[PDB]
DNA sequence: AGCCGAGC
DNA sequence: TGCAGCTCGGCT
DNA sequence: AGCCGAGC
DNA sequence: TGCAGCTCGGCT
């Protein structure tokens, strides 16, 4: 033909076309898996063609984007399909080169989404094909369990998890690429277990597909996921299993059951990775990046590409690394309209306001590291209070961090899921610190306007969650105006191509409005000088300059959707709602921080006490350890008043409160240096001990608010340092 | 005006053409440096055009490769040159678009080489231009020193090194890319000290250029570098300076002085990075890689691209990282005809014999780590005997590693320099181990034939350093032969395309000789089955099958050129020369290893002695340390028989033995565990002490030859394990 | 006529 | 940043 | 009609 | 493994 990545069945287009199956694979390695799996014999009736990734949702796409979609058009050419055609009698089916399409994807949520889009494609264009078995799938296992003789295959994590309810070598298949050639030829030998047939069952199949993929069914999807989330929350409260879909010998799957028990898992997982948490402002990928950074604790820059590989490994990030690198870049950007406080330093070219960051260099050629602000906003001390998650016996990132200000409002959370989307604008950090200080003194918080670091324009409320964002334009003389700010997130080059150039050149609907203009930007600032006739500039000030030069955009925030501290999606009407809920939790954790520090400092002081009485007890000699025995001396030591390691006797302890959530050791004296008994080391132990006694008391005095205020002071000091240093470059 | 990377002087080609200078830069960053350095003002009379890297040596190039060289053709179009033309009267000069070329390169040896090739280009094609000031250079500093007010520039490392004027912040410029825009505009403001003009002085200039770049002057270059190396040995023996070339206010440099004082430094550095050392078989880049691996001590695979960045940093490798990655790949390859013992593991697709390794994947996508054989061949214990080099104030790789067999013959050292080249074939490791064992027992070594791991053919001597290498071909029946080995370094696809295909298809000079052939290879083996008429097969066996099917190559080794242990180039006539010279050195270092271990183990036992007598003294109470003073016991313990840390009293001392190359510490008792006074710590010290006494005695009895034999045994066992494991995959 | 490889 | 097509000497 | 970004 | 052109919802 003329399609490069296609491997056409030898019998395709011939006389056995209707006995031919085209295999559509998620990506190029899946294709390789298919071709080796099919072998020599399989090339007669089985084609293989790979799609790059997600494909166009044709159901309400535009005519133009449909007719220009090379991948959709390739499928149509391979299969021999024809739009508007009905495939019912024997003449219609003579034009097909293939009789069926078999979909082969990762056994994961994003695979289910691709299958859904393919189903959506056939359902919307050739329902005569879809009602008569034209579509199947080739499933493969997500997890395998091998005892010694017999090898097991599980097609979903809940199936595998529940099989553990019996009593031994476990391998995980993250994508089709994990399988080997020998495993592939195995799968295709057992076609009867791996081929599943999509059955069309009635109108409820149409309703289901439409519910998942129609632009007119956003409300229905909201209800649909709300049921799923609460209903899952229930089974998961009453310890019931979570249902899975490929445990039976059934070779049939209705479109309704696919949508409602498989595609819905993608939709829910999509919201989980795309909608941020109220508590720390992160999405899970972001949180993993930052957990990895905290773990490495890099004193020097790290190449973005390398940090991504490190993040993937250290935190169990199972997606492609390009996206992770894009996430790292987005976290480090610091131009006007991106982050108000970038937690990662952009060491290299991470993007500018001239192109909205799309001029960032390759992640192989730029570097980053923690901003000095990062551990001031996410104090390491508080790590002792989080719930670290597990991914296959590996401890990874927490469910959320508990920062000292609501980061969710500092950098403007944004995410698109299914059913819901999130858009929060940026808020000034100092204004938030002040509102926290107000609430900490029993005052009501002040209402807050959106505010973008280094933005020189103005933002004014219009109604609730509606704001007028304006740049800066000045009249210079009767012929000249100067533009010195664009509205937030209007990029310099876009404005120049879409506003000034049409004003200079005229259009078909409008003649030219300006006579000339020149540019005078820096990397981080905007200066256009625009020339006009006296008359035209007089009618531009009359008609309002911000209007004429399109220096005004609306900003509407009626979709502030976030996961609360419990992991429930929730819609916040105002940012003050968000700030009160955050405040209310963060103040609780300061209470546990004070509690936790009391326990540890106490163990540290009780420790320093046993360490103390021993040494000065053998300074004058009331106990002997010379040529005794481990046997004797531990029992000798319990016999007297000496405690087994109090720090290790307070860590094991606080465990056991969290255990129930979802021998004697005197080494601390005895591992002590032999030096510890000398007057210029004994006097230091008494001071250290007496200092530690005061440490617990100096903190015993403090309120949680006192601790929070301390953190806030330390933060604003560094923020002053860091931001003015930024300005001197 | 159709060339993409050129920035043409606004006045180029116009009427001031002969006042225009084209600037040729080493790469695209140098170009950028030139454009910002020149600014708006400089674009009238100054062009900028970048060359990718090294360029064609046109002096005896072929007509075809000259006429097809896009870069040389680009220069000719930009400047307006014309071959065979003489540029003398005013009509001839009317065709030039530019009056002179200014060369801008790194201030390093590879920059000088590029300048030389450009000079060579002009000298060979337009001597009327080169004799009348057509060529200049723009030098920049390699080192800068900034005091507080005044900033200094050095244009050669010996000049910066030669400045005994001492009493302040030193920066190094590795390439033109180190400079900033501000530094560039500075350089171009001071055009008068950065522009140097090449002067043609007489025939000695022609002789010098010809000496450096003519294919007929290899012998002369050999003499030329021999003088340089020996004369340098002298200037560096009596502690005299090495003259440098840009310290004066002279703005003129003859071609003869450029060749003989600047280009020669490239020629010598070229041999140093391309000609291996006899002692360990490495080139300096390779040695740096392996030093980095030994340092990291990676228990797990590392991305090749990442290891390269690590090597650059950890070992001060100042060249581009693409080349380093190629070196890592070459070190890890293990197909037939590459390494007999790959010291790095090829974890991924590092190349196959089907394409001579040129099918290796990208270094961003493949992994490696030390072979378990590496520290068996280069024992870590022996690192204490090496001379680690210094780059700036960083300790880096040694001058050579001294392995337990002559690695220079295991993997076939090869390199192309200037004046000399090196080619060693592979030699069987077990045959070398046996020859070392023979020499270790006072026997003469056996002569050795080249031998390639997994090569199934034969290698036979023809004369001195000449060998017939043969693949394997069999007669199967009256119509069929089978080819099961190609001669070493004949790659499968090349043989198929250049031998079998012309035999199958015929050519214009010869008709077809075979009727069919089929392939049956693995990734690591060769199987062709070839069909012929009975008559044709009979005339092929008569004429000899290895001849007919070109399964025989000659291997000639009359250029076994290596740096000896002193860093002098040497030409070895036979492989036995190489092995005897290696033998005498390696046997010496086994003597120092025995010496070193004796000294160290002794300090360790003298240490365990003081540590021992001490504990037994306050076991029964002959010393009191309870509540005394650091003041007191340093003199208290020295007053009595106690030695300050002997290990750290054997290292500090042994330092100063290498110094001449070019208070009391009793913490080891007192930092001891408080447990040191215990039933199971006293007897544990007595065995430990008494074991260490036996340690020195078991080793005092051993000969150096005994130690080498031990190493060889441990090595051969692991080579047996590793090589059969290789065969079961 | 072009390979071998450490460089630009 | 490295590109792509070259360097350098001795064979083949 | 297209941005916003975490995914394939 | 990523490509390139998409998904998904709410504005603009």
Author numbering:
A (entry chain B), B (entry chain A): 452 to 618, 624 to 1118, 1135 to 1201
Sentences reproduced from the published study:
Top2s in mammalian cells can be divided into two subtypes which are type IIα (Top2α) and IIβ (Top2β). And Top2β is associated with DNA repair and transcription. Especially, site-specific cleavage of DNA by human topoisomerases IIβ (hTop2β) has been reported to be necessary to activate the transcription of some genes. Beyond the vital cellular functions, Top2s are considered as an important target protein for some of the most active drugs for the treatment of human cancers.
Using the well-established system for hTop2β crystal growth, the crystal of hTop2β cleavage complex containing two monomers of hTop2β and cleaved DNA chain was obtained under the action of compound C-Bi with the resolution of 2.54 Å. All DNA base pairs were visible in the electron density maps. However, no molecule of compound C-Bi was observed in the stabilized hTop2β cleavage complex structures. The structure of the hTop2β-DNA binary complex revealed a looser assembly pattern than in hTop2β-DNA-etoposide ternary complex and other DNA-bound structures. However, the changes of structure were mainly located in the DNA-gate, and there was no obvious change in the C-gate. The distance between drug-binding sites Arg503 of the two monomers was 26.62 Å in hTop2β-DNA-etoposide ternary complex and 34.54 Å in hTop2β-DNA binary complex, respectively. In this work, perhaps because of the loose assembly of monomers, the distance between Arg503 and +5 guanine base was increased, and no hydrogen bond was observed. Similarly, the phosphotyrosyl linkage that should existed between +1 nucleotide and active site residue Tyr821’ was weaken. DNA-intercalating isoleucine (Ile872) still bound between the +8 and +9 bases. DNA chains were more significantly twisted, and some bases could not be paired with each other (+1/+4). Lack of base-pairing and torsion of the DNA chains leads to an inability to re-ligate the DNA break, thus preventing repair of the DNA damage.
